[PDB]
């Protein structure tokens, strides 16, 4: 399964989760930013690695990072 | 003079030694 990490430059704009087509990420309470929220990746077993989240990120170089890893039926996006 | 029938056959027999040694080396490197 791919790895998804969220670093402390997160502004909590929620576009991470809004872009995910597989519900890997969540908005969880935090205190580092004004929005009092941060992105989390509790369900990376369903991640396919399309990179939509990072495409949505505004911070100067991403606060969310997807590193493709061990390929499974789910991560390869297989319907068969 | 040309090469002999026996020299060709003796070549394969001798080559049996590096074949066995290559088998051993390959199987050891698999570990």
């Amino acid at each position: 399964s791919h790895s998804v990490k969220i670093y402390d430059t997160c502004i909590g704009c929620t576009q991470c989760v809004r872009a995910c087509p597989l519900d890997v990420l969540e908005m969880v309470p935090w205190d580092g930013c004004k929005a009092a929220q941060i992105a989390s990746s509790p369900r990376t077993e369903d991640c396919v690695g399309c990179k939509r989240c990072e495409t949505a990120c505004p911070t100067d170089f991403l606060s969310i990072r997807v590193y493709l890893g061990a390929e499974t039926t789910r991560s390869m996006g297989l319907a068969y | 003079m040309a090469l002999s029938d026996t020299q060709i056959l003796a070549a394969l027999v001798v080559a049996l030694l590096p074949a066995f040694l290559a088998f051993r080396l390959s199987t050891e490197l698999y570990k």
Binding site: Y7, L22, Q37 | -
Partner: protein, 141 residues
Amino acid sequence: MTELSGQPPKFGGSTGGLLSKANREEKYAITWTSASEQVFEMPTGGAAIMNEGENLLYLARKEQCLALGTQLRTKFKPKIQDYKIYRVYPSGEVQYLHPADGVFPEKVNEGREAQGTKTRRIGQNPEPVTIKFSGKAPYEV
């Protein structure tokens, strides 16, 4: 997870739906309620009709279910936001999946534990040479 209920959408069939993986490995279910009998686009191709009331539909992947869910909540004049997505195993086990804690993941909800969080910047990952011959990568340490 008790027993999934809901009528299947009115649909004439297609070649784009479930394959062997559904029975050998895993399949996915999405339920939702509709205030009216109305047309929607199948993620597997073509048009189908959702029933007034509860609806239950089986798809091959989680992504197809979430695509149908976005279509339901963003492409109907009164939105459809009550959809639920489950994972289904051949043993019969049903695993509720989405929305995970009854609240859509885009908005904060109390009780969620941060996963995959790092207390540093991306630029503050360690040099790979410092972690070589280990099993980790700079983002895993």
